Amino acid sequence: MKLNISYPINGTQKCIEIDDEHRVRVFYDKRIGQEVDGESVGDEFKGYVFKIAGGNDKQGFPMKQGVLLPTRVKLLLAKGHSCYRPRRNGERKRKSVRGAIVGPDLAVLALIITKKGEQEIEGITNDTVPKRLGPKRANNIRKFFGLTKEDDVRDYVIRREVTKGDKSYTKAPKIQR
Amino acid sequence: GISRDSRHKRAATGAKRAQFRKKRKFELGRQAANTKIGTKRIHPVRTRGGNQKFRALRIETGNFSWASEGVARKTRITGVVYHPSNNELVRTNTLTKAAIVQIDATPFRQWYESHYGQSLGKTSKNTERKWAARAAEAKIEHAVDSQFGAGRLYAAISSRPGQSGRCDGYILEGEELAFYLRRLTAKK
Amino acid sequence: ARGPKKHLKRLAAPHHWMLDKLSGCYAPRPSAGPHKLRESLPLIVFLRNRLKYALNGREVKAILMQRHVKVDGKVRTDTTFPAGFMDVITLEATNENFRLVYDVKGRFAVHRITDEEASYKLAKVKKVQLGKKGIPYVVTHDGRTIRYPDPNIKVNDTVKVDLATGTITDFIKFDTGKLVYVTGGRNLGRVGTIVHRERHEGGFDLVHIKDSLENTFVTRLNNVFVIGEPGRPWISLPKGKGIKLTISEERDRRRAQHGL
RNA sequence: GAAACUGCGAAUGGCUCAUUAAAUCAGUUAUCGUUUAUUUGAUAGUUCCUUUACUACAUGGAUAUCUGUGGUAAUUCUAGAG
RNA sequence: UUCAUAAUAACUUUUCGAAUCGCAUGGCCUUGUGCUGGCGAUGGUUCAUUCAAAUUUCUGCCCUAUCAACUUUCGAUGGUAGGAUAGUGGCCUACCAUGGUUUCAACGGGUAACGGGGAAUAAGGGUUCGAUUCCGGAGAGGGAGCCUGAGAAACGGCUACCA
Ligand SMILES: [Mg+2]
Numbered sequence: 089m090k091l092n093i094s095y096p097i098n099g100t101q102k103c104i105e106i107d108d109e110h111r112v113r114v115f116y117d118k119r120i121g122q123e124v125d126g127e128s129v130g131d132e133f134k135g136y137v138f139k140i141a142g143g144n145d146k147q148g149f150p151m152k153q154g155v156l157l158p159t160r161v162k163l164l165l166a167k168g169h170s171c172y173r174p175r176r177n178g179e180r181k182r183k184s185v186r187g188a189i190v191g192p193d194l195a196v197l198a199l200i201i202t203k204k205g206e207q208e209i210e211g212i213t214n215d216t217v218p219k220r221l222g223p224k225r226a227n228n229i230r231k232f233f234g235l236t237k238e239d240d241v242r243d244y245v246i247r248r249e250v251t252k253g254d255k256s257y258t259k260a261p262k263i264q265r
Numbered sequence: 266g267i268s269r270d271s272r273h274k275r276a277a278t279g280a281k282r283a284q285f286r287k288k289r290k291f292e293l294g295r296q297a298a299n300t301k302i303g304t305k306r307i308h309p310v311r312t313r314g315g316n317q318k319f320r321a322l323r324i325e326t327g328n329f330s331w332a333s334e335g336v337a338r339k340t341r342i343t344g345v346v347y348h349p350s351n352n353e354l355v356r357t358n359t360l361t362k363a364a365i366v367q368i369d370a371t372p373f374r375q376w377y378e379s380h381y382g383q384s385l386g387k388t389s390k391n392t393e394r395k396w397a398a399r400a401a402e403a404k405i406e407h408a409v410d411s412q413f414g415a416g417r418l419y420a421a422i423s424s425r426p427g428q429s430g431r432c433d434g435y436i437l438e439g440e441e442l443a444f445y446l447r448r449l450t451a452k453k
Numbered sequence: 454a455r456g457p458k459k460h461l462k463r464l465a466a467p468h469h470w471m472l473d474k475l476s477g478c479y480a481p482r483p484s485a486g487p488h489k490l491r492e493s494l495p496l497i498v499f500l501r502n503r504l505k506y507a508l509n510g511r512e513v514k515a516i517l518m519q520r521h522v523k524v525d526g527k528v529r530t531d532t533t534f535p536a537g538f539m540d541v542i543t544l545e546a547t548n549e550n551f552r553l554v555y556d557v558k559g560r561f562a563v564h565r566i567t568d569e570e571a572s573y574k575l576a577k578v579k580k581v582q583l584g585k586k587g588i589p590y591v592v593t594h595d596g597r598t599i600r601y602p603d604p605n606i607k608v609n610d611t612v613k614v615d616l617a618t619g620t621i622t623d624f625i626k627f628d629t630g631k632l633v634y635v636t637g638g639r640n641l642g643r644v645g646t647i648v649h650r651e652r653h654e655g656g657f658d659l660v661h662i663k664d665s666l667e668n669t670f671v672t673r674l675n676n677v678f679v680i681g682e683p684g685r686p687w688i689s690l691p692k693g694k695g696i697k698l699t700i701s702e703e704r705d706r707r708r709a710q711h712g713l
Numbered sequence: 714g715a716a717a718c719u720g721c722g723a724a725u726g727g728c729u730c731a732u733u734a735a736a737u738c739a740g741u742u743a744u745c746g747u748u749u750a751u752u753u754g755a756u757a758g759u760u761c762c763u764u765u766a767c768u769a770c771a772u773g774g775a776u777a778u779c780u781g782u783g784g785u786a787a788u789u790c791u792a793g794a795g
Numbered sequence: 796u797u798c799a800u801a802a803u804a805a806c807u808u809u810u811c812g813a814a815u816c817g818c819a820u821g822g823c824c825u826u827g828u829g830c831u832g833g834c835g836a837u838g839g840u841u842c843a844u845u846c847a848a849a850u851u852u853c854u855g856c857c858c859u860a861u862c863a864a865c866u867u868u869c870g871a872u873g874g875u876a877g878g879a880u881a882g883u884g885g886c887c888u889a890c891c892a893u894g895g896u897u898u899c900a901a902c903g904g905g906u907a908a909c910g911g912g913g914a915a916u917a918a919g920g921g922u923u924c925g926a927u928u929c930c931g932g933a934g935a936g937g938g939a940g941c942c943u944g945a946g947a948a949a950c951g952g953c954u955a956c957c958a
Pocket residue numbers: 454
């Protein structure tokens with residue numbers, strides 16, 4: 089089934105389709121938050137290792153963390169929980185949700201790559217996705233720079249330039265605190 | 266869901282009132298605290314108009330006051346020995362208001378020792394002159410000395426742990442204590 | 454209803470706002486403020502209706518927003534502000550100053566009153582209490598809480614707030630033979646002198662009032678507002694001074710004073 | 714100035730008369746028997762705890778919006794990553 | 796009034812006591828980013844006031860006796876203590892007392908009964924109507940249960956059963 093792999097440090101990710109019944113066999117009976125070696129999921133995944141963080145059932149129901157069940161169940165979710173977003177304040181809703189144990193009923197497996205392996209993936213182990221925007225709070229910028237705090241962080245704010253086609257203009261965030 | 270409205274009760278005459286309206290929210294009643302002893306565990310409850318209330322189930326220590334010389338000290342509740350409403354709470358060690366409990370009684374003891382120094386159960390010149398000015402006026406009655414020798418004081422709680430969350434009360438003393446010993450001797 | 458009510462249908466508005474029973478389904482509900490809504494007067498009513506300076510709701514909103522209304526020396530930019538009895542409304546445009554006092558028909562009449570006296574205001578003492586740290590304080594009918602009052606100021610008494618600093622300037626002690634105003638019931642707008650104040654142990658004090666025309670009535674003490682000493686009112690009484698001419702006397706006034 | 718977070722209202726208004734015969738309601742009282750966002754008027758030095766070593770010229774981490782990957786036939790369904 | 800308030804002893808899984816925004820940015824010269832400094836906007840503890848909300852006293856309701864006794868083991872009336880309540884209160888629990896209403900119609904039954912301000916009718920007395928333009932109450936298919944908030948047992952809010 090579909091596997092959504094995500095490398096955090098490169099900040100990249102991809103979707104991979106697998107049809108063989110045996111590469112996914114190791115994913116069976118493995119709950120969210122566990123680690124599975126990359127040798128047993130693909131001969132191109134040598135050295136790799138997969139943290140399992142959520143997924144989607146064949147009916148589209150996501151798997152909630154800490155359900156420890158290989159089936160679906162109806163749960164009364166509220167604010168703070170996953171698999172639900174409340175519209176009104178304190179609006180509890182009873183919704184279906186897949187259990188945290190991975191079984192054959194799954195359709196997408198959300199997987200983090202943790203350890204860099206031997207054979208490199210196309211654009212995940214190689215390419216890096218830049219951060220879309222930098223820090224905003226003053227001390228956050230200082231920490232992101234290691235700026236020896238008493239150094240007038242005023243100027244060191246990043247400044248993104250965009251060209252309208254006729255005018256090049258700068259846009260930089262306002263520093264809070 | 267526990268209502269406290271008067272509608273469900275019969276009329277003074279005795280007629281069975283028909284249901285006028287489904288019970289409201291400003292008439293609600295919540296579960297009893299039925300507090301216990303040990304491992305302090307107070308749960309906040311958000312009541313009408315904010316105004317946090319504190320359920321004080323499983324409370325071990327609290328403030329207790331002595332009326333004669335009027336001094337308050339934090340001390341441990343050690344079991345309940347009498348309850349004027351239901352002895353079942355006594356058997357289950359459920360602590361509610363007006364219950365009668367025993368006190369570790371040490372803090373009162375060395376407060377007395379550092380305050381009068383009469384060596385119950387059987388220095389700087391300033392302290393000596395204070396004691397001389399006191400002139401052995403600490404003639405507190407005999408029964409409290411008896412349980413001081415025993416080591417456990419007899420206190421009656423006065424705070425409501427169900428609402429306040431605290432565990433405050435006052436020692437039985439004077440004729441008060443007398444009365445309850447009679448009742449306790451009825452238990453004995 | 455489950456919670457506060459925020460709409461005032463037109464017929465349910467007090468008959469002293471005395472609006473038009475047609476031309477509208479609702480009436481301006483006064484927002485929470487210094488006066489009871491039954492006794493108060495929204496600024497929109499005072500401007501659109503009493504003064505006709507505006508024409509409708511938008512005009513009153515524009516008037517209040519640009520900070521030309523000053524209720525007791527403060528702006529009060531909300532349309533339904535409850536400008537109640539004895540409040541002062543200042544318009545720097547037209548440099549005009551009004552004080553709300555009932556005309557003897559019993560209505561909030563438009564009383565153009567001078568700038569010099571517009572500096573201060575009168576108030577009735579509704580409570581005298583001791584707040585935290587043993588600090589005496591006095592609560593007037595506006596809800597103004599004046600701290601550190603004169604030690605012999607008592608309840609039902611009257612005070613003269615300077616309305617600039619908001620402190621106590623002078624006060625009048627309630628007792629017999631004293632000029633007085635009425636603020637409720639059939640005797641709205643009536644002005645007289647206290648002849649007797651029967652106690653009635655257990656509640657609901659009553660006072661007897663005799664006016665200049667030598668007519669006599671009786672009114673509740675909650676309903677009473679001492680206004681000064683006889684012959685020397687502490688404010689400028691409205692036209693007619695609240696004598697409550699009889700209907701036949703009013704007809705004779707219409708017939709006699711008549712020029713067209 | 715979209716979106717989203719935050720705040721506030723959504724308990725007002727509108728409709729109907731099914732239930733209800735000391736029930737509702739009306740007039741008249743009481744709350745020295747209580748909660749009260751808001752509006753209005755006032756309202757606080759002590760947060761030091763042994764004060765002869767602290768950020769007060771400003772303390773920390775997430776988090777939506779967004780960038781991208783999806784799932785379900787579909788619902789104001791939303792899981793993973795930054 | 797055990798009130799307002801004050802004071803002593805203590806207590807707290809220690810609430811608040813501005814690390815927030817806009818405009819104008821003046822004065823002092825200790826002439827530096829130095830010292831101060833106005834008008835507001837949001838907050839914020841407490842006490843008042845207002846919008847209120849809950850209860851609450853007396854009196855008042857249509858027909859029916861082919862409804863004369865009704866209520867209490869399951870609260871019926873009261874006592875005490877506790878629990879819960881925002882708060883009084885059999886509102887609930889524990890233990891006691893056996894009490895409360897009734898021929899001045901209680902209790903039960905009926906209402907093609909929501910109550911009222913009012914409408915028709917009109918010598919006077921009255922008779923009938925009042926679902927509906929205002930005030931109250933109740934309800935969102937029938938039932939229960941609840942989160943958020945100051946305020947809901949909310950339903951153009953959720954949970955479950957029944958249809
Ligand atoms: Mg309504």
